[PDB]
Design a binder for this molecule. Structure first.
Ligand SMILES: Cc1cc2nc3c(=O)[nH]c(=O)nc-3n(C[C@H](O)[C@H](O)[C@H](O)COP(=O)(O)O)c2cc1C
Length: 383
């Protein structure tokens, strides 16, 4: 009882759908009929570095392991084999009861242009947190990350959206998540961007700000604030306990701090493109700071950044405008999850959510008509 099709009735640019598309090619085949729709594959791009070639010819794919997702290891990260490599290792099988289809005839493999990049296929690599960044310093993995991103840039002209990169330590909270603010991170990021560029593929950076999803103890350790939209609403009992235990209560953002966050967004974007990135994506989904401001359950502010649909979307659009005026509208994308209830979001329960995100896409399209259209709009499917 939910759909993201309304965005198509409002936003007239490229739309990147993501979620539960790997094991359902009969759905993708219907969804690619729309000429401006791209498909992202999450888990099976971790499980298969050559997933694109397996989607073109209808090859069987490999099983993904749930335990190797957020674990620090080379295992289940860069050890996944190609099709031929999976054949040379014998079998005693791959996936279970599954019927693959060849989408090489569909619209998935006809070229399209997003931003300054010329995609030869419409298979997108969504942002994926692997939790393998070096701590401390939030440095991307020097031993594995380069190889990891290089393996999935196998198909020429493959759009890659990197994992959530903290625009600032203040936007941090995860010790195993890579950053973008410091030069030490920018060296490794430059190496990765080059490694992807040499394979004739493209790389996009997801700008990440945890919000209330951050770990209060990790922030109190570095003398940072545990902040959100409102200070009277919390995630859960654990996040509530960790805040008072570590003597770091949930902080309500003021104007100055918001402007600071925006400045950090701009600096993060310019630093990203200085390292050789194709563009940046604003993560306003999955119950993080921007999404926290968007969602009425998390946003109870009475000031300029809350109280209404126009006010709750002011932050996201502020970041959008800032980045557009910074690096250009062709290097800026947006990530949204209307029906996502992750990190204590409303989702389908709130009857006004569709109106909120319709307002978002509306403002976006209005800016698009003005001559400044974003490269794409990333959507997370209901599940
Ligand atoms: C291990 C893992 C990490 C993820 N990390 C992020 C993330 O950092 N940022 C984001 O926007 N989405 C993230 N996602 C969500 C993906 O963008 C995508 O929606 C998800 O993989 C579901 O796609 P699928 O069911 O087709 O595999 C993550 C998903 C997984 C499984």
């Amino acid at each position: 009882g939910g759909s993201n099709d309304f965005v198509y009735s409002i936003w007239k640019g490229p739309v990147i759908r993501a979620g539960n598309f790997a094991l359902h090619p009969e759905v993708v085949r219907e969804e690619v009929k729309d000429k401006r729709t791209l498909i992202g594959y999450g888990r099976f791009f971790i499980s298969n570095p050559d997933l694109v070639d397996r989607l073109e010819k209808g090859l069987p794919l490999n099983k993904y392991d749930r335990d190797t997702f957020y674990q620090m290891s080379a295992h289940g990260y860069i050890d996944y084999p190609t099709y031929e490599e999976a054949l040379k290792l014998g079998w005693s099988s791959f996936v279970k009861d599954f019927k693959p289809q060849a989408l090489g005839d569909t619209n998935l493999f006809k070229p399209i242009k997003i931003g300054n990049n010329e995609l030869l296929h419409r298979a997108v690599i969504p942002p994926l947190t692997r939790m393998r960044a070096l701590h401390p310093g939030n440095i991307p993995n020097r031993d594995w990350a380069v190889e990891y991103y290089t393996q999935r840039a196998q198909r020429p002209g493959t759009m890659i959206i990197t994992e959530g990169a903290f625009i600032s330590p203040q936007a941090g909270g995860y010790d195993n998540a890579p950053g973008v603010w410091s030069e030490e991170q920018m060296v490794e990021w430059t190496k990765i961007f080059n490694a992807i560029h040499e394979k004739k593929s493209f790389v996009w950076v997801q700008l990440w700000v945890l919000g209330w999803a951050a770990f209060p103890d990790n922030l109190a350790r570095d003398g940072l604030r545990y902040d959100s939209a409102s200070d009277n609403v919390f995630m859960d009992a654990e996040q509530e306990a960790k805040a008072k235990k570590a003597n770091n209560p949930q902080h309500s953002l003021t104007k100055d701090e918001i402007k600071q966050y925006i400045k950090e967004y701009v600096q993060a974007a310019k630093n990203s493109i200085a390292a050789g990135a194709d563009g940046v994506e604003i993560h306003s989904a999955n119950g993080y700071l921007l999404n926290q401001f968007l969602d009425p359950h998390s946003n109870t502010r009475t000031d300029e950044y809350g109280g209404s649909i126009e006010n709750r979307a002011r932050f996201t659009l502020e970041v959008v405008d800032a980045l557009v005026e910074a690096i250009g509208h062709e290097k800026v994308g947006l990530r949204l999850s209307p029906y996502g209830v992750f990190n204590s979001m409303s989702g389908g329960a709130e009857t006004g959510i569709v109106a909120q995100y319709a307002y978002v896409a509306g403002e976006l399209e209005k800016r698009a008509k003005a001559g400044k259209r974003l490269a794409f709009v990333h959507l997370v499917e209901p599940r």
